[PDB]
Design a protein around this motif. Structure first.
Motif, PDB file in Angstrom:
ATOM      1  N   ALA A 175      36.254  20.809 -47.764  1.00 56.73           N
ATOM      2  CA  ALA A 175      34.908  21.374 -47.745  1.00 56.73           C
ATOM      3  C   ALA A 175      34.448  21.654 -46.319  1.00 56.73           C
ATOM      4  CB  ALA A 175      33.934  20.432 -48.454  1.00 56.73           C
ATOM      5  N   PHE A 176      34.642  20.685 -45.417  1.00 58.41           N
ATOM      6  CA  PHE A 176      34.284  20.898 -44.017  1.00 58.41           C
ATOM      7  C   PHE A 176      35.120  22.004 -43.390  1.00 58.41           C
ATOM      8  CE2 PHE A 176      32.314  16.609 -44.164  1.00 58.41           C
ATOM      9  CZ  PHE A 176      31.096  16.947 -43.602  1.00 58.41           C
ATOM     10  N   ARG A 177      36.378  22.141 -43.816  1.00 63.51           N
ATOM     11  CA  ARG A 177      37.231  23.207 -43.301  1.00 63.51           C
ATOM     12  C   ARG A 177      36.721  24.575 -43.734  1.00 63.51           C
ATOM     13  NH1 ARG A 177      41.923  21.733 -41.022  1.00 63.51           N
ATOM     14  NH2 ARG A 177      41.745  19.749 -42.153  1.00 63.51           N
ATOM     15  N   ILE A 178      36.361  24.712 -45.011  1.00 61.65           N
ATOM     16  CA  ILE A 178      35.829  25.979 -45.504  1.00 61.65           C
ATOM     17  C   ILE A 178      34.511  26.307 -44.811  1.00 61.65           C
ATOM     18  CG2 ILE A 178      34.743  27.018 -47.534  1.00 61.65           C
ATOM     19  CD1 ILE A 178      37.123  25.349 -49.053  1.00 61.65           C
ATOM     20  N   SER A 179      33.661  25.299 -44.605  1.00 61.36           N
ATOM     21  CA  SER A 179      32.389  25.533 -43.930  1.00 61.36           C
ATOM     22  C   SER A 179      32.600  25.915 -42.471  1.00 61.36           C
ATOM     23  CB  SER A 179      31.499  24.295 -44.035  1.00 61.36           C
ATOM     24  OG  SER A 179      30.992  24.146 -45.350  1.00 61.36           O
ATOM     25  N   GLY A 180      33.551  25.264 -41.798  1.00 60.57           N
ATOM     26  CA  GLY A 180      33.829  25.607 -40.413  1.00 60.57           C
ATOM     27  C   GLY A 180      34.337  27.026 -40.256  1.00 60.57           C
ATOM     28  N   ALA A 181      35.206  27.464 -41.171  1.00 57.97           N
ATOM     29  CA  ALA A 181      35.703  28.834 -41.118  1.00 57.97           C
ATOM     30  C   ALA A 181      34.616  29.834 -41.484  1.00 57.97           C
ATOM     31  CB  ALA A 181      36.908  28.993 -42.046  1.00 57.97           C
TER      32      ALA A 181
END
Length: 196
Positions: A175-181
């Protein structure tokens, strides 16, 4: 016992998840887009606006930015948080589903109108909060993760404990990865907006 919040822009697989949770006795609440689609399909989904939210206030731009919704995601299992959830009558949100609209490409002189109002503010707040509190909230974003979560809940009688700690952390990191991208792409559009 249970409550899910469905705030997705990409509607793929959202109906088998919402329906699967409703048959398990869950309460399913949705933002504006998901709600009309699921209700026209005949599912007893609730409006996240009227429910614990703030509808029509600013065109609905704060509808998930309330104590009830964000508290239901961020509250710990401490004595102090349990007490305050009880005092104010805030149920726990066991599952958060948040998706983003497709963004255009960074071209020089990019008009901000082509991407800006598609940017989600309250959505990622719920998803990043769910991922941070993954022991008590399931954070879902990728529609390819819906089935495994729904199947896990179905083997364990619909109880949130049926999704183990190990699977929750993997979804939280994702989730944090998708938000960061998501934020890095939006930054690229703002940067391209400043060129000629």
């Amino acid at each position: 016992h249970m409550l899910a919040v469905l705030a997705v822009s990409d509607k793929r697989n959202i109906e088998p998840l919402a329906a699967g949770l409703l048959r398990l006795g869950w309460r399913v609440a949705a933002t504006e887009g998901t709600y009309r689609l699921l209700r026209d399909a005949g599912h007893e989904v609730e409006r996240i606006a009227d429910l614990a939210g703030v509808p029509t206030l600013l065109g609905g731009r704060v509808k998930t930015l309330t104590v009830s919704v964000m508290g239901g995601i961020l509250a710990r299992e401490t004595e102090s948080d349990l007490r305050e959830m009880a005092e104010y009558g805030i149920p726990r949100i066991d599952l958060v589903c948040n998706n983003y609209y497709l963004l255009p490409e960074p071209q020089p002189g990019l008009d901000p109108a082509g991407f800006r109002e598609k940017v989600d503010v309250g959505g990622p707040a719920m998803l990043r909060g769910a991922a941070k509190n993954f022991e008590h909230v399931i954070p879902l974003s990728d529609p390819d993760d819906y089935d495994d979560v729904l199947k896990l809940l179905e083997q364990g009688g619909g109880l949130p404990s049926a999704v183990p700690v190990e699977r929750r952390l993997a979804l939280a990191e994702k989730a944090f990865r998708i938000s960061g991208a998501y934020d890095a792409s939006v930054a690229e559009l703002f940067g391209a907006s400043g060129s000629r």
